[PDB]
Design brief:
The complex is a heterodimer of chains A (322) and B (322). With 322 residues, chain A is mostly helical. Chain A has two domains: 200 residues, hpI Integrase, Chain A (Orthogonal Bundle); 111 residues, DNA polymerase, domain 1, CATH 1.10.150.130. In chain A, 53% of the residues lie in helices and 5% in strands. In chain A, helix 11 runs antiparallel to helix 12. With 322 residues, chain B is mostly helical. Chain B has two domains: 202 residues, Intergrase catalytic core (hpI Integrase, Chain A), CATH 1.10.443.10; 111 residues, DNA polymerase, domain 1 (Orthogonal Bundle). Chain B has 14 helices and five strands. Chain B has a three-stranded antiparallel β-sheet, with helices on one face. Chain B has a two-stranded antiparallel ribbon with strand order 4-5. In chain B, strand 2 and strand 3 form a beta hairpin. The N and C termini of chain B lie far apart (76 Å). Classes of the chains: A mainly alpha (322), B mainly alpha (322). The interface between A and B is large, with 49 and 34 residues. Chain B binds four DNA strands through helix 2, helix 4, strand 4, helix 10 and helix 13. Chains A, B: InterPro entries: CB, DNA_brk_join_enz, Integrase-like_cat_sf, Integrase_catalytic, Integrase_recombinase_N, Phage_Integrase-like_Recomb. Chains A, B: It comes from Punavirus P1. Chains A, B: It holds the Pfam family Phage_integrase.
DNA sequence: TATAACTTCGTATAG
DNA sequence: ATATGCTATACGAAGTTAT
DNA sequence: ATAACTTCGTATAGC
DNA sequence: ATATGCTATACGAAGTTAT
């Protein structure tokens, strides 16, 4: 009892060992665990094998994906392994349930999804539809869609871009010094170049936003219902908003969502990555050159984004078709 | 305890099982650690996790790299584990703070650097200049640089080359047999072949040096101020010296180093290794080949040596501007 | 003799 | 090569603020 | 009121 | 990415020795 008390103390002391996103995910499973526990009358700490087993089967019946269920058992294991208690994973029962749960769900046809592709053809359409709009928020959203599809950057990354990071490269095109790595052995930063057109799109946004009045202002900002931008160097556009620009843009062209509870029915924050990656493959860009685009050090993700491309059908098809 | 003393005694007895450098650092750390303990009135062995934690934060606060801080923790770990005692990393306090130290440092931008590349052009330009020198020193250096780039061998392996290790192909190309490297203790050994041009550079050195006088002579040796090579079958040219060749060569082409005090402002011992790896990548050379070339067994290391090839390629810009 | 060209060595940091 | 597991995106919805 | 976000909570993709 | 375990390089400072 003392030993766990101390180990809990360790964690909050070096709570910085993890990102707030992680902690938030940890607290979410405890609340879930604790609530299922009190409800079913089981001590939630230290968790017992059968109880955990019973909970995991409950998450499965709850319709949660295998990775989600693994994430629940995961955190639960952290807590225990960290404190002086054994991890439920080391128990025969839990080990067995996850196993059957895994294949039962795979058997049912569970598949990992990914963002709906936002391709050049999509960008062209949007660009056309909104090219001549004078609406501030529209100008912002086109520039965003340009940078996002052009740079393949992630949403949290586009969010952090300040004005002082935009340099002018050859031809007048824009260059954005950005940071897309978070490991010791990696590249501290990269420079992203924008085509002539996309640079023009962003040029208009900044001109109609005033984000440039102060270099420390983030490229993208809030635009209120009056169509009036709200520059700032301290607060940035949330990633939810950036996700909003994608969904909203999808509605513009396809109207209300395809209902259903399904995910990726409209565009999301990773849609441009999936799209740029596939156009690059379609254009025959050197596989590594594609990795540079998105910052991949392996081809695992890019192979998923282009899995259905005819250029990736394989040897057997190549042989059969001579 | 008596076993502890015994295990340490065993360790020391079979010192040769470990590299001289491992021992070197084991003692340097113990020097750091024991000084901190003394300055804080603590027992330096066995170490108490809470104490080791304060030590690490002390190191991070002294402005040391994550890798050097992980080094100090690693030596304490080996020491304790070899002693039959629990490793500091075994405790929550120590494991959490390390993750925290690393996280924060990386978050603020720390990146493990790598040697300034010495590529094909740097070699051509250097050869083109030193090619005409008659000085024994110059002839040795050029040959050294040539083997470094051609074989990618680390400076400690180049310095262990004995004249008897050199062979030749019927094509008239030199083959240098290498037995032990940083990552390999085998009797199998590999044959590192040199190009016709590089064999030539190596020949001129052998001829003007006289190391061939005895096959058990190290291929490389010192060259005193009067131009007389001092062969030896018991003493190799120090790796510290081989590093000086790279630095002096860089100073040749670009003058005296910056006064920033930073590392890698001039070519160093690993410059040709990373530079050649990057040249092959650029060349479109398959990973198994680059692997063979550098004596790498894993693919991650290669990508690690390539790590800084990550730059704008203009792949998307070209795609959008058409 | 002065000194080029090392060598040895310790702390720091990459592979 | 596979996990494992930390961290980011997903997205419906509640909370918030200036038109 | 309500556009346009932001802040949440928690599922699930990406390293 | 990541945590072992450990082996090698980076580089300024100071000591060495045939010229």
């Amino acid at each position: 009892s003392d030993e766990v008390r101390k180990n809990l103390m360790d964690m909050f002391r070096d709570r910085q060992a993890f990102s707030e996103h992680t902690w938030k995910m940890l607290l979410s499973v405890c609340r879930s665990w604790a609530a299922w526990c009190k409800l079913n009358n089981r001590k939630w700490f230290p968790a017992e094998p059968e109880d955990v087993r019973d909970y995991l089967l409950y998450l499965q019946a709850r319709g949660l994906a295998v990775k989600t269920i693994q994430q629940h058992l995961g955190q639960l294991n952290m807590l225990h392994r960290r404190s002086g208690l054994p991890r439920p994973s080391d128990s025969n029962a839990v080990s067995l349930v996850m196993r059957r749960i895994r294949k039962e769900n795979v058997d049912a046809g569970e598949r990992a999804k990914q963002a709906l592709a936002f391709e050049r053809t999509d960008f062209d359409q949007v660009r056309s539809l909104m090219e001549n709009s004078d609406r501030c928020q529209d100008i912002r959203n086109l520039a965003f869609l340009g940078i996002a599809y052009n740079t393949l950057l992630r949403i949290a990354e586009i969010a952090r871009i300040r004005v002082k990071d935009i340099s002018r490269t050859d031809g007048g095109r824009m260059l954005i010094h950005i940071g897309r790595t978070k490991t010791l052995v990696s590249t501290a930063g990269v420079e992203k170049a924008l085509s002539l057109g996309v640079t023009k799109l962003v040029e208009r946004w900044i001109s109609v936003s005033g984000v440039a009045d102060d270099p420390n202002n983030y490229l993208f900002c809030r635009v209120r219902k009056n169509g009036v931008a709200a520059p700032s160097a301290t607060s940035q556009l949330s990633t939810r908003a950036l996700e909003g620009i994608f969904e909203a843009t999808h509605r513009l062209i396809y109207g209300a969502k395809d209902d259903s509870g399904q995910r990726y029915l409209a565009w999301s924050g990773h849609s441009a990555r999936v799209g740029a990656a596939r156009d690059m493959a379609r254009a025959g860009v050197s596989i590594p050159e594609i990795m540079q685009a998105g910052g991949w050090t392996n081809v695992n993700i890019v192979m998923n984004y282009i899995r259905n491309l005819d250029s990736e059908t394989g040897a057997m098809v190549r042989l059969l078709e001579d």
